[PDB]
Amino acid sequence: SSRVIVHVDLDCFYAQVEMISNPELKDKPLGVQQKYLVVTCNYEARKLGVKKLMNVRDAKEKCPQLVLVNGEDLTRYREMSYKVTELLEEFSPVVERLGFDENFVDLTEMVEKRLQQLQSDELSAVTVSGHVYNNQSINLLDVLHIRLLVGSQIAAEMREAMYNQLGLTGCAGVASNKLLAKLVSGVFKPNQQTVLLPESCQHLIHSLNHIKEIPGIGYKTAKCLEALGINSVRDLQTFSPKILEKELGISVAQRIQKLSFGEDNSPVILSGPPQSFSEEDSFKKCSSEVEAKNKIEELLASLLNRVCQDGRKPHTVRLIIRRGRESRQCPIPSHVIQKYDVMTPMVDILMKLFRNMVNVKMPFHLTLLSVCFCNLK
DNA sequence: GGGGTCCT
DNA sequence: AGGACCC
Ligand SMILES: Nc1ccn([C@H]2C[C@H](O)[C@@H](COP(=O)(O)OP(=O)(O)OP(=O)(O)O)O2)c(=O)n1
Ligand SMILES: [Mg+2]
Numbered sequence: 402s403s404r405v406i407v408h409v410d411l412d413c414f415y416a417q418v419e420m421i422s423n424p425e426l427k428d429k430p431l432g433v434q435q436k437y438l439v440v441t442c443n444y445e446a447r448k449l450g451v452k453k454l455m456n457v458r459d460a461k462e463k464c465p466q467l468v469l470v471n472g473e474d475l476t477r478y479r480e481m482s483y484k485v486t487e488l489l490e491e492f493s494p495v496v497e498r499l500g501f502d503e504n505f506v507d508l509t510e511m512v513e514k515r516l517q518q519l520q521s522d523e524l525s526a527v528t529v530s531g532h533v534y535n536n537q538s539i540n541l542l543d544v545l546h547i548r549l550l551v552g553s554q555i556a557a558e559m560r561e562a563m564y565n566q567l568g569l570t571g572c573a574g575v576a577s578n579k580l581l582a583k584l585v586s587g588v589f590k591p592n593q594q595t596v597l598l599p600e601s602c603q604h605l606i607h608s609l610n611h612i613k614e615i616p617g618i619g620y621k622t623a624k625c626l627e628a629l630g631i632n633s634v635r636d637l638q639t640f641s642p643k644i645l646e647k648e649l650g651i652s653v654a655q656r657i658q659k660l661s662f663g664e665d666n667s668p669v670i671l672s673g674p675p676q677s678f679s680e681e682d683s684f685k686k687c688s689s690e691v692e693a694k695n696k697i698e699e700l701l702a703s704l705l706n707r708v709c710q711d712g713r714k715p716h717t718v719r720l721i722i723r724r725g726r727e728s729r730q731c732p733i734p735s736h737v738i739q740k741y742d743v744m745t746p747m748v749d750i751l752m753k754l755f756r757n758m759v760n761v762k763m764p765f766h767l768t769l770l771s772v773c774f775c776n777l778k
Numbered sequence: 779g780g781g782g783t784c785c786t
Numbered sequence: 787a788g789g790a791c792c793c
C-alpha cells in the first residue's frame with residue numbers, strides 16, 4: 402500500500418535556539434562554536450561567506466563581524482529537540498527522530514481520514530501548500546496525487562504550529578517513503594516546503610551528483626563503490642547485482658540498490674524516550690591511567706545529571722576507547738541504582754573495564770574516551 | 779570532531 | 787563487541 406511520509410528539518414538548529422535564547426542576536430550574523438569550529442550558523446551569517454563546519458579562524462577572516470556563541474552544551478538544544486518531537490506526536494503518534502533537528506511522521510492514516518470526510522463535491526477544491534517538485538503539473542483525478550496534496554497541507558499546519566508555539570522555522574518534505582521525503586525536503590530552503598509526485602521521482606534521484614548523497618550510503622559504502630567505478634546514481638542503478646552482492650553482501654547490496662531507484666520500504670519507527678545517553682571526548686594524547694581517571698571522572702559527572710532527570714534508570718554502563726573503536730560493558734550492581742555517593746563506586750567499575758581493555762603496565766595512547774549509560778528500565 | 783540509532 | 791548509518 403502507498404504511504405504518505407513527511408520529513409521535517411529545522412533551519413540551522415543550534416543557531417535558531419541561541420537567538421530565541423538571546424534576542425540580541427536576531428539582527429546579528431551568528432555561528433555556534435564547538436571547540437575550534439563553527440558547526441552551524443544563521444542565514445544572515447551565511448551571506449557573508451560562512452559555511453557549515455568551517456574553521457573559526459577562516460570564519461572571522463571571512464566575516465570580521467561574526468558573533469560567536471558556544472554550543473558545546475547540547476542541553477538547551479535537546480529540550481527543544483524533544484519539544485519539537487512532542488509537538489508533532491500530537492498530530493500522529495508515530496514520529497521517528499533523526500539527530501536533534503529532523504523528524505519523520507507517517508501521515509498515511511491521518512490523510513485517509515481527512516479524505517474519508519471530504520464530500521465528493523469539494524474534491525476538486527483540494528489544493529497544495531508549498532512547492533511541487535520539478536514544477537510538475539497536478540493531476541487531481543489521480544488518487545495518489547490527492548493523498549499527497551493533503552499531505553502537504555498537514556505539513557503546512559505542522560510547520561505553523563512549530564512556529565506559533567515554539568518559534569521555530571523549518572522545511573518539510575512530503576513523498577511516498579522516508580528516502581524521498583528526506584531528499585525533497587531540502588529542495589527549497591530555508592523555512593519552506595516541497596512535495597514530490599511519483600512521476601518526478603526519477604528526476605530527483607538523478608539531480609544528485611555524488612553517490613554518497615543518498616541517505617544510507619555513507620563513508621565506507623561509498624569508498625566500496627567508488628572503488629568499483631561506481632560514481633553516479635545511474636552507475637549504481639545499472640551495476641550488476643550479483644557482483645554487488647558478492648562485493649557488499651546480499652543484505653546491503655539489495656537495499657542500497659533499491660535506494661538508487663528511490664525505493665525505500667522501511668517504516669517510520671516510533672522513537673519514544675532515549676534508549677541511551679553519553680558524553681564524548683577526543684584529544685591528541687593520553688598516556689596515563691591517572692589522567693584517564695580524571696577524564697572518566699568528568700564525563701561521569703556530566704552524565705549523572707541527565708541520567709538523573711529522565712526517570713527510569715540505566716542497568717548497564719560501557720566504556721569506549723579510540724587508540725577504530727572498541728568497547729566494554731557490564732551490568733551496574735543493584736545497590737548502585739540508588740541516588741548519597743555514586744561516583745567512586747562508578748569510576749571503580751569503569752577503571753576495571755578500562756584496564757581489561759588496556760594494558761596499563763605498558764605504554765598506551767588514546768585519542769578518545771567515552772562513557773555510556775543504557776539498558777534503561 | 780561530538781551524540782545517538784540500528785544490523786549483525 | 788563491533789560495524790555501519792544518521793545529524
Ligand atoms: N557531523 C555533524 C553534523 C552536524 N552537526 C550538528 C550541527 C547542526 O546544528 C546539527 C544538525 O546538522 P544539520 O545537517 O541538520 O544542519 P542544520 O539543520 O543546522 O542547517 P541547515 O540550515 O543548512 O539545514 O548537528 C554535528 O555536530 N556533527
Ligand atoms: Mg538536515
Ligand SMILES: [Mg+2]
Nearest residue numbers: 410411412413
Ligand atoms: Mg534543516
Ligand SMILES: [Mg+2]
Nearest residue numbers: 613614615618
Ligand atoms: Mg549519504
